[PDB]
Design a protein around this ligand. Sequence first.
Ligand code: TA1
Ligand code: TA1
Ligand code: GTP
Ligand code: GTP
Ligand code: GDP
Ligand code: GDP
Ligand code: MG
Ligand code: MG
Lengths: 429, 429, 441, 441
Amino acid sequence: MREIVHIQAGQCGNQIGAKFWEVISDEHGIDPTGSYHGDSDLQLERINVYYNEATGNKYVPRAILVDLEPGTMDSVRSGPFGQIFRPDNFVFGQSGAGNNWAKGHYTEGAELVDSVLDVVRKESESCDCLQGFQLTHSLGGGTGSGMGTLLISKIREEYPDRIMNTFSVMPSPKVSDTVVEPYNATLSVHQLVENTDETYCIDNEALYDICFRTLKLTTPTYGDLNHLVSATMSGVTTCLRFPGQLNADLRKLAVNMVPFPRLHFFMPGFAPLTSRGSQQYRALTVPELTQQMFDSKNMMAACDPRHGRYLTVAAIFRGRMSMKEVDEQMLNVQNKNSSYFVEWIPNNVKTAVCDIPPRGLKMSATFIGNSTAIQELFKRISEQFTAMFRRKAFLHWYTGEGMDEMEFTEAESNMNDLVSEYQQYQDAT
Amino acid sequence: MREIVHIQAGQCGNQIGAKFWEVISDEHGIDPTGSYHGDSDLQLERINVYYNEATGNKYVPRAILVDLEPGTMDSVRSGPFGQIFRPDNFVFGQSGAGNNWAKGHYTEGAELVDSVLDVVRKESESCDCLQGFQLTHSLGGGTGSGMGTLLISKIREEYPDRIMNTFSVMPSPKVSDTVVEPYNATLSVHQLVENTDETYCIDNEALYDICFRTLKLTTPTYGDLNHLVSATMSGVTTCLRFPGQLNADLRKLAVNMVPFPRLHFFMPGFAPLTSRGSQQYRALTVPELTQQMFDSKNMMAACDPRHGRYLTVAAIFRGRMSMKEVDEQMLNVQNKNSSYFVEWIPNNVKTAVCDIPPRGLKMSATFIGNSTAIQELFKRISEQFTAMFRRKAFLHWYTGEGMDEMEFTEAESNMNDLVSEYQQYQDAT
Amino acid sequence: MRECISIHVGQAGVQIGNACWELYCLEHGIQPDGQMPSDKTIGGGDDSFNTFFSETGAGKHVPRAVFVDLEPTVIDEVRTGTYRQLFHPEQLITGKEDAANNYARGHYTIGKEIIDLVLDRIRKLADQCTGLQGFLVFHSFGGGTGSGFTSLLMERLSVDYGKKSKLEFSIYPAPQVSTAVVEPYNSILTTHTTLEHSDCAFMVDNEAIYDICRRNLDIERPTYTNLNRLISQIVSSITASLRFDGALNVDLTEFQTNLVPYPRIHFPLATYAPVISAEKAYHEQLSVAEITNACFEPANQMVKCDPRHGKYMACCLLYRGDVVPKDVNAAIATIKTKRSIQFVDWCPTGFKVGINYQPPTVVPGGDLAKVQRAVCMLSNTTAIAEAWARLDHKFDLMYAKRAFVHWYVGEGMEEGEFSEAREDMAALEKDYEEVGVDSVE
Amino acid sequence: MRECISIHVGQAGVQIGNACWELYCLEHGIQPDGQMPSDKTIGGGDDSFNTFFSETGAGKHVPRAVFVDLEPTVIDEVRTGTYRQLFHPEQLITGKEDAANNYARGHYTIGKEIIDLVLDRIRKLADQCTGLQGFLVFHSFGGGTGSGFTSLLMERLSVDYGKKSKLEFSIYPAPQVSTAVVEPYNSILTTHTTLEHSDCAFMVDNEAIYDICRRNLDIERPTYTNLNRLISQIVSSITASLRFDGALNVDLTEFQTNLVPYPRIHFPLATYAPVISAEKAYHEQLSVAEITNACFEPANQMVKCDPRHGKYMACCLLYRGDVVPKDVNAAIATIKTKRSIQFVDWCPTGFKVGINYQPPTVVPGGDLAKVQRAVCMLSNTTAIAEAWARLDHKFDLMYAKRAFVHWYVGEGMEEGEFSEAREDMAALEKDYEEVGVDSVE
Ligand SMILES: CC(=O)O[C@H]1C(=O)[C@@]2(C)[C@H]([C@H](OC(=O)c3ccccc3)[C@]3(O)C[C@H](OC(=O)[C@H](O)[C@@H](NC(=O)c4ccccc4)c4ccccc4)C(C)=C1C3(C)C)[C@]1(OC(C)=O)CO[C@@H]1C[C@@H]2O
Ligand SMILES: CC(=O)O[C@H]1C(=O)[C@@]2(C)[C@H]([C@H](OC(=O)c3ccccc3)[C@]3(O)C[C@H](OC(=O)[C@H](O)[C@@H](NC(=O)c4ccccc4)c4ccccc4)C(C)=C1C3(C)C)[C@]1(OC(C)=O)CO[C@@H]1C[C@@H]2O
Ligand SMILES: Nc1nc2c(ncn2[C@@H]2O[C@H](COP(=O)(O)OP(=O)(O)OP(=O)(O)O)[C@@H](O)[C@H]2O)c(=O)[nH]1
Ligand SMILES: Nc1nc2c(ncn2[C@@H]2O[C@H](COP(=O)(O)OP(=O)(O)OP(=O)(O)O)[C@@H](O)[C@H]2O)c(=O)[nH]1
Ligand SMILES: Nc1nc2c(ncn2[C@@H]2O[C@H](COP(=O)(O)OP(=O)(O)O)[C@@H](O)[C@H]2O)c(=O)[nH]1
Ligand SMILES: Nc1nc2c(ncn2[C@@H]2O[C@H](COP(=O)(O)OP(=O)(O)O)[C@@H](O)[C@H]2O)c(=O)[nH]1
Ligand SMILES: [Mg+2]
Ligand SMILES: [Mg+2]
């Protein structure tokens, strides 16, 4: 069966990843010690996907952790699930990146990529057949932007035929937690156009919006932004792990969802998101999930979807459903929104229906959509970039680590060609 | 049945040998007093190999101890197993070698070799049939380099048809515990090309590496470097002592493992080596042992195996196995590593499967491999040698004991011909 | 483990080192005799973190500190006080005479022949550490050893260490109140090696902290004990991410990447939120939007410097304690709306938030008390250029009259050194006039 | 059993022998009256090892020591002190007059007719021992009997014993401080038989141990009692492998093989790690990497000699106590990286580690205390040649004026002996100029 390797780079990466392997564990019914104590027998058939076996009935995730520069080491180890990862996988060095790209890709990345890929190959050959290389990294930072895209330059090189999904947390128009941030996005999108099959554009503002405009949370901590990301991360590989009525791999999505090989920057949604105790004033049905998925205040990429045409979308439904209400709710949205889609594609939406819900819910979904409205996430950075680069503002912390000025103009030429190949299909014809 | 005599020369020799007869004892279930108190009846059938009998149910190893120059005498006697060796075997003199070769081979060796060989012949004729003469000695030192290769000049002379294995601890590129050390290696490899059938090249750096890079030991003492050597020393003669499904003597190895009569310098590995309490995150299987055996960080000779082609290798498996997973894991490595082996040999790897594991483990192995990558252990010494010999640096402590300058040029001519007959097969054709 | 080497220099540097190491010993639990009897009750945790404390086998803890002052009078307070047995007994005194307030006795006369003990002691101290290094230098401008001897200590540590980060925390001469008449001579000669070697120079001042100790703290007579604790609270939350467990930690290398646009404009003008009294510890909410708005008014800058007459370039909000990361962005979109808080065109990102969540502790003996959160904003503005022009003017007014200068050139230094230090500060002030002005098309 | 014969000569040799035999009696348990009441409580072990102690049947122990000084004043301190009844009563005094600081009274006048008692006493002492021999000679250069009488004792023991190892531990005249004005004459005449007969000559000095007793030990007034204990700690860990149970023992024959490249460059310049105070016995880790790096700085060499102005040839790190053999190689690959610690081309191996694991003990009465490990590095560098040129220059400055020389030639010695001792030291200094220079191709 089909098996996935999960890689975690940048300090944003394992913080999502530590919450990621808690959602996966409770979805399979697996304790902190890896002992299976699940309810049914239906969740052992694809433990093989994420958890390879161990000696006595214990399960270990195939989780490489590149990002444990030692400030994060003894919190992930001294966490809820520090007794579940294999301790040889904790690959790191000393003197972390420093919110620097060139100290992730050229200087400290080159003296660590050999120690990572010696564990990547030891986790590939313990598998029957691989397809998946999930990389949870973030743009903007250090390790997650230079070293996160150094491995994709190497892992795609040693595996030219694997589906490479990178759940890439992106910068924001207002929330600026990094001063150098328009450099670590331009230099990393230049790598993630060439070297990935799909990559999910997630922002913190549209995660800050849902925890206030929809979930009504008083103080959304960083755990409650990762608990929303991870509910999508276990929503793309649901049909891999669980039986269904219309299955969808990580490749039936990434053949349908992508028209042209550069147009693979996705915005993920999730439903049902709502705020309650145990008294909520609604009814979980198939037309109830549909309106919330397509709603412009339940994206995650923090762009306005009604500014552009959706190229094609994928609605990975879960739970027990009826396929007529699935195929007819996906029809009426496409007709009411005839300008909001691309006219010159026959049917835009595809459907994927699994048969096992989450633990507490009755039904759920995942809106993965490829839109031209993500032109706004790349135009804002390319305006912030050429403002900093015109003065040659922060460049002596990068050219003092080995780079050249003629790699900066290479990176802005590539991002400006995505905006050209998004403004085209946003226009009508 | 087939019986082995174990000889211990140099102070490195009995220190390995005192740990050697503790691994052998616990493998047969034998107390410090030699009284058999084993678990099963299956480990009495070949006590004859290492332990000849005594009067009342007690067992004595056929261990000659040449090296007990009296600083080591009352520590081996006042040790864990000083009450197991036969006290007439403790053959020594006074005024030990002094890290000198000529005081091991010409002056104090000549006045002691008659007292050793009067005990060698009294341990040969107490046997039905001998094949084995294990000599645990070390290069670099005094007794272990001059007197250790004086006996092999005599024992091979009085026994031209015995398998002569010498587990020879070799010098290091960085760890220099002897200033005269490139003299005691050149003058002793000149003896161990002509006079042995097989000799195992063991270094301390690759034993210091495993106790840090793999076993994660805080302070590896000298006992914990010998506990790794001795786990190979009881891994070559396993099929002699225990029944199996495909047996291998000390001679089925040394007919297969050696192409040409000078190319018999081996590098030994061992698996499973891992660091745990009782919670380890793995699974002992036949493909699990295989990747660790061939891994370049689990040799012992401290050379890089991927720099050269393996001539042929031998994988002496133990424990309960399946021969299909043995013969197919040894196949896929040879195909993935088609340049890393010699092309013009049909099948390089042989297999040896015993049926009794160690005491605590479930399965184990021993990678004994003949490689051209051991050209590096002989090129480094031959550069350190001709640096010292050009100035005639330390020669007046050797020519003042009877030698001549025309034996130094004889010894460097022999070691430089091994490098010529290793660079050839490392090249492709 | 990441670590720092705290090198105090001068009397100003050692007097601040009385209270920086008084604060560290109370957070981690270390008594004034090296032991840790606090964590012995629980029985776990390595809280005497190896950032600041070498550990010996007998349970005692030794700091990473060395300090040189060329006068025994200052360090003999340390060698007889409460912290006698804590430090290693190599606190380098050896000065047979004080510097006497000049840069020439100083960089040349008696700073040489004592520096041979200094560099070898750092090498005996730096080679016990694996990982990050950073030299926390402590001195003042204007003095003799804080200006002269630091200048010799920088060009001899930019060679034996190369590219290591050097955070030096200088007390700058106030434009209105000066405790020496030759202090404008020393604080222009020390810029010629602060600009070149030390990558990041935190300037604070004595008059701007006098007003904070009078207005907010409501102390009518603030001595030097009560000023050095406020710098100690700042220095703690600069190097707090190297110790404690935060939600966004900021390493000392992450300062260099963010705070410093150009290699010669590294002067970032620290602040804090010290509105504790502690009578006013009640009567006041002190939320995230409250303590972030403390940097708005120019009555809370630590330097006598008006930020409203200049741009900003890059800021670094560093929080402590019970901070939720959502509340921060409410207190940042507010600041990017206010039109007198003025940025440049070429930095649209602005800020950077480091949320450590260990609360700042209280030194017993006054003068503030237990607040639940804090902030140490670090922002290199363009406004520091007018803080230097009120010091080049003090230099130029007594350089035409050739005053005080025979004690500078009659101690080995040439009289041409002064105009070489003027042509930097004239050209370095010229750099701030270009960076703040945007380009038009 | 392996053993040594400790032959002290002169007043310097006997005064060191006061404290070398004070140290041995405390390690093994021997009281100052021969008994061993320490091991009588346990009831086992032969710890009064036969390396240094002959044993008689009545439980008393007798050392292997004989000492000759040609003056009763020194040995009458031993014959009336605390160690009166310990030694055998043949401590050879018999000198009706002191040597009076010359080599000619000396090798010729009164050294002869007393040597007949000396050699026969060694033969009565050497023939009680089976196994290894080694003559631990103790004298000083510059003196009368330490220079003259040792020179007669070497050419009369290189004939009756042949090829036995002779470790002689000479105190060398300091280049700046000399306690005699004729000491440059004696320390050039004693080289003509030190070079030929004694195979290994450990030179130490008094000025380089004065700085160690002031800087590290922090003793302001070090008498000769406190200097001879530091040589005694060195001499213990030279002959420690002959007694105690180590993980890598180094025999006295293993010195000759390793330390000595050529038969005439045997001068290896001992060191130690005496940074105990014992106030500074705290405040400091003292690991394997710490005590091995004590040999880096030239403020811890036992000879006033700068190793940075010369190559090394071969070193011999000899440890004590709680040393793990892994930690050693970390402290050696470090040293082979540092580019001022300079080797020759023709010795790529470098070092040799002898790990004894008995800790060095503490003589009660000061001045250091119980450290857990130590090191006695022995390294013949090229730098000892500049330590001799500052002594040939003292010889040549008063040889042109024909000073002091009528008391040398008017005592049997010819005046041609001086230029025969100059043509060695000119040619022996010429040997160190060739060995340090590598050959090019
Ligand atoms: C009584 C009842 O029905 O309670 C629900 C509930 O009230 C609501 C509000 C839940 C609740 O979720 C949150 O409040 C929340 C908190 C942080 C981040 C994201 C969400 C719930 O906590 C979450 C919880 O979710 C699950 O049990 C899923 O299996 C979910 N699990 C986790 O995220 C998880 C949490 C802790 C530990 C381990 C796993 C999941 C979703 C996708 C993929 C895998 C797992 C559910 C249904 C509920 C509560 C308990 C109140 C909601 O969320 C989810 C993920 O279901 C929020 O909006 C939905 C709608 C639910 O009805
Ligand atoms: C609970 C449990 O399973 O414990 C294991 C264990 O944890 C591990 C880590 C053991 C352990 O070995 C070491 O830690 C070690 C120490 C010094 C030198 C070399 C190894 C073990 O100590 C060693 C011990 O080995 C044996 O019992 C073998 O029979 C072995 N015996 C000896 O070496 C020996 C030791 C002391 C006294 C007498 C014999 C052996 C191997 C080859 C040939 C003959 C004998 C075993 C399996 C274990 C422990 C006990 C933890 C490992 O080693 C061996 C030799 O098995 C180290 O990596 C392996 C993997 C094992 O799983
Ligand atoms: N905040 C604070 N400032 C101080 C302290 N001591 C001195 N200063 C200031 O430092 C400046 C004087 O420099 P000092 O550090 O006293 O001088 P020094 O470095 O000892 O140099 P010389 O005495 O000239 O050798 C003045 O501006 C003082 O106000 C102190 O303990 N705290
Ligand atoms: N370390 C040390 N040095 C000493 C001692 N006694 C003398 N010296 C040094 O030895 C040199 C003088 O030689 P002495 O040993 O006193 O002379 P001597 O051997 O008795 O010879 P004469 O008196 O000339 O017959 C000077 O350099 C002294 O500093 C001592 O007890 N310890
Ligand atoms: N969702 C989420 N975002 C984070 C987390 N930690 C940091 N970030 C974001 O990640 C970016 C900073 O990069 P970070 O991962 O901390 O830097 P790195 O360690 O150099 O990769 C900013 O956009 C932060 O808002 C986290 O735990 N969750
Ligand atoms: N593995 C191991 N190596 C040793 C031991 N003792 C010494 N050595 C090594 O042996 C060499 C020194 O030779 P040694 O046996 O002590 O000298 P000898 O007594 O003259 O033969 C060096 O390379 C040491 O690192 C030991 O007990 N175990
Ligand atoms: Mg002062
Ligand atoms: Mg005298």
